[PDB]
Motif scaffolding. Structure first.
Motif, PDB file in Angstrom:
ATOM      1  N   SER A  15       0.641  -1.246  -0.061  1.00 14.57           N
ATOM      2  CA  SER A  15      -0.117   0.009  -0.071  1.00 14.57           C
ATOM      3  C   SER A  15       1.012   1.155   0.089  1.00 14.57           C
ATOM      4  O   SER A  15       0.539   2.552  -0.659  1.00 14.57           O
ATOM      5  N   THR A  16       2.246   1.330   0.728  1.00 16.57           N
ATOM      6  CA  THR A  16       2.852   2.732   0.698  1.00 16.57           C
ATOM      7  C   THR A  16       3.467   2.690  -0.821  1.00 16.57           C
ATOM      8  O   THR A  16       3.382   3.894  -0.986  1.00 16.57           O
ATOM      9  N   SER A  17       3.739   1.796  -1.316  1.00 11.86           N
ATOM     10  CA  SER A  17       4.280   1.917  -2.596  1.00 11.86           C
ATOM     11  C   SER A  17       3.256   2.414  -3.682  1.00 11.86           C
ATOM     12  O   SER A  17       3.669   2.917  -4.539  1.00 11.86           O
ATOM     13  N   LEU A  18       2.013   2.026  -3.519  1.00 13.44           N
ATOM     14  CA  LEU A  18       1.054   2.354  -4.368  1.00 13.44           C
ATOM     15  C   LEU A  18       0.753   3.967  -4.066  1.00 13.44           C
ATOM     16  O   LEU A  18       0.431   4.779  -4.932  1.00 13.44           O
ATOM     17  N   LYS A  19       0.601   4.279  -2.724  1.00 12.98           N
ATOM     18  CA  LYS A  19       0.392   5.679  -2.192  1.00 12.98           C
ATOM     19  C   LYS A  19       1.551   6.764  -2.823  1.00 12.98           C
ATOM     20  O   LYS A  19       0.796   7.772  -3.469  1.00 12.98           O
ATOM     21  N   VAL A  20       2.558   6.348  -2.789  1.00 14.84           N
ATOM     22  CA  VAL A  20       3.714   6.960  -3.190  1.00 14.84           C
ATOM     23  C   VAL A  20       3.415   7.272  -4.510  1.00 14.84           C
ATOM     24  O   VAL A  20       3.643   8.407  -5.099  1.00 14.84           O
ATOM     25  N   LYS A  21       3.525   6.360  -5.504  1.00 12.26           N
ATOM     26  CA  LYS A  21       3.366   6.566  -6.865  1.00 12.26           C
ATOM     27  C   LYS A  21       2.272   7.483  -7.189  1.00 12.26           C
ATOM     28  O   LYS A  21       2.341   8.203  -8.094  1.00 12.26           O
ATOM     29  N   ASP A  22       1.225   7.236  -6.452  1.00  9.96           N
ATOM     30  CA  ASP A  22       0.004   7.897  -6.744  1.00  9.96           C
ATOM     31  C   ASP A  22      -0.168   9.319  -6.370  1.00  9.96           C
ATOM     32  O   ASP A  22      -0.377  10.176  -7.066  1.00  9.96           O
ATOM     33  N   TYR A 115       8.101  16.812  -3.895  1.00 11.70           N
ATOM     34  CA  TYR A 115       7.390  15.387  -3.173  1.00 11.70           C
ATOM     35  C   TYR A 115       8.293  14.784  -2.411  1.00 11.70           C
ATOM     36  O   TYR A 115       7.693  14.240  -1.170  1.00 11.70           O
ATOM     37  N   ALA A 116       9.426  14.303  -2.787  1.00 15.64           N
ATOM     38  CA  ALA A 116      10.571  13.508  -1.757  1.00 15.64           C
ATOM     39  C   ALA A 116      10.493  14.174  -0.552  1.00 15.64           C
ATOM     40  O   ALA A 116      10.353  13.299   0.480  1.00 15.64           O
TER      41      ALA A 116
ATOM     42  N   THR B  16      13.076   5.203  -3.096  1.00 15.30           N
ATOM     43  CA  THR B  16      11.470   5.159  -3.434  1.00 15.30           C
ATOM     44  C   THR B  16      11.427   3.927  -4.602  1.00 15.30           C
ATOM     45  O   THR B  16      10.414   3.264  -4.606  1.00 15.30           O
ATOM     46  N   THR B  17      12.282   4.066  -5.422  1.00 17.72           N
ATOM     47  CA  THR B  17      12.492   3.118  -6.455  1.00 17.72           C
ATOM     48  C   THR B  17      12.709   1.644  -6.223  1.00 17.72           C
ATOM     49  O   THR B  17      12.472   0.741  -6.580  1.00 17.72           O
ATOM     50  N   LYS B  18      13.222   1.526  -4.913  1.00 23.29           N
ATOM     51  CA  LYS B  18      13.713   0.150  -4.423  1.00 23.29           C
ATOM     52  C   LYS B  18      12.388  -0.175  -3.640  1.00 23.29           C
ATOM     53  O   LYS B  18      11.894  -1.451  -3.543  1.00 23.29           O
ATOM     54  N   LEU B  19      11.496   0.845  -3.100  1.00 21.59           N
ATOM     55  CA  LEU B  19      10.265   0.454  -2.535  1.00 21.59           C
ATOM     56  C   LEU B  19       9.302  -0.156  -3.627  1.00 21.59           C
ATOM     57  O   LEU B  19       8.883  -1.113  -3.318  1.00 21.59           O
ATOM     58  N   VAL B  20       9.237   0.501  -4.605  1.00 21.63           N
ATOM     59  CA  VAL B  20       8.229   0.079  -5.615  1.00 21.63           C
ATOM     60  C   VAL B  20       8.792  -1.117  -6.341  1.00 21.63           C
ATOM     61  O   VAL B  20       8.057  -2.107  -6.378  1.00 21.63           O
ATOM     62  N   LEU B 141       7.928   2.318   7.044  1.00 21.00           N
ATOM     63  CA  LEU B 141       6.681   2.327   6.272  1.00 21.00           C
ATOM     64  C   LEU B 141       5.488   3.185   6.849  1.00 21.00           C
ATOM     65  O   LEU B 141       4.806   4.012   6.079  1.00 21.00           O
ATOM     66  N   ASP B 142       5.149   3.136   8.225  1.00 14.87           N
ATOM     67  CA  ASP B 142       4.228   3.955   8.581  1.00 14.87           C
ATOM     68  C   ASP B 142       4.432   5.569   8.359  1.00 14.87           C
ATOM     69  O   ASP B 142       3.730   6.141   7.959  1.00 14.87           O
ATOM     70  N   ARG B 143       5.851   5.870   8.797  1.00 16.80           N
ATOM     71  CA  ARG B 143       6.034   7.238   8.493  1.00 16.80           C
ATOM     72  C   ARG B 143       6.184   7.942   7.278  1.00 16.80           C
ATOM     73  O   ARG B 143       6.083   8.965   6.957  1.00 16.80           O
ATOM     74  N   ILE B 144       6.255   6.910   6.390  1.00 13.91           N
ATOM     75  CA  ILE B 144       6.460   7.315   4.809  1.00 13.91           C
ATOM     76  C   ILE B 144       5.153   7.918   4.462  1.00 13.91           C
ATOM     77  O   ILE B 144       4.237   7.246   4.512  1.00 13.91           O
ATOM     78  N   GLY B 145       5.067   9.186   3.877  1.00 10.30           N
ATOM     79  CA  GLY B 145       3.970  10.090   3.681  1.00 10.30           C
ATOM     80  C   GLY B 145       3.643  11.043   4.591  1.00 10.30           C
ATOM     81  O   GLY B 145       3.418  10.652   6.258  1.00 10.30           O
TER      82      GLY B 145
END
Lengths: 139, 145
Positions: A15-22, A115-116, B16-20, B141-145
């Motif tokens: 889900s974190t990956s989907l959110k970030v992309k989005d 964004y980053a 971020t890439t590594k995450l995706v 992961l929780d903190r990302i965003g």
């Protein structure tokens, strides 16, 4: 580390990956750029080395050959790249930036920076290699 | 947007890439898991069912809020799930403009088998990650965003 926690972790990961992309895409669109994250990632490659061959780009792409090519057609139709039958082949393409493709480096990198920084602000520099190395060892 | 301690953009992009890429590799590795092993199912099917086994008869609105993601797909799968004999819609007795999601007779029996598979697959997936690292991963992961 029993099933419950691993299932959680798998699901935050996805889900974190989907959110970030989005979120990054929303940011591009808010600023007038009608592109996706996939488009941004492929452009990143070509800003480094223009004229990458198609096959190499698929290798590089974190994605599979049919998806990457599909994504590239869309980019072609948006005017970002062109395809060329290779100087030394047939069936084998080099992908080149158009002027539009080059023009977009500064602006799209700026937006992704913004964004980053906001997206990672609760994370410390030194956590990144941890995070990353844990990501590496999954699968 | 700024601060006295900035991180290097290239490093954030790589993470971020590594995450995706890792999300993708993990979904791919697991998309086989159930069908390849005797159960005509998919991921997304399974992840919803998890919610349903926790709470059978949940509202098609509570679901969409745990599921996080979009309804038409949330809905489309639900339809296919309903096609397969996995869930049904009963119409909420609180009032209409409101649906309730219930497990088929299959969907209840599928819990043990699919959980067994998933769990052995989760164990593989996380086998080089230690017990201390797991909640670290999770917190980050929780903190990302």
């Amino acid at each position: 580390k029993d099933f419950e926690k691993l299932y959680e972790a798998t699901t935050k990961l996805v889900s974190t990956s989907l959110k970030v992309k989005d979120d990054l895409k929303k940011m591009f669109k808010q600023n007038g750029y009608d592109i996706t994250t996939d488009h941004y990632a492929l452009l990143r490659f070509l800003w480094e080395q223009d004229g990458i061959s198609q096959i190499d780009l698929c290798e590089k792409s974190c994605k599979d050959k049919s998806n990457t090519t599909r994504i590239l057609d869309v980019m072609k139709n948006k005017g970002l790249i062109v395809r060329k039958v290779d100087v030394k082949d047939r069936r084998k393409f080099q992908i080149f930036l158009t002027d539009l493709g080059r023009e977009l480096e500064e602006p799209l990198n700026e937006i992704a920076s913004i964004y980053a920084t906001e997206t990672f602000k609760s994370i410390s520099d030194e956590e990144l290699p941890l995070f990353t190395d844990i990501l590496d060892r999954i699968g």
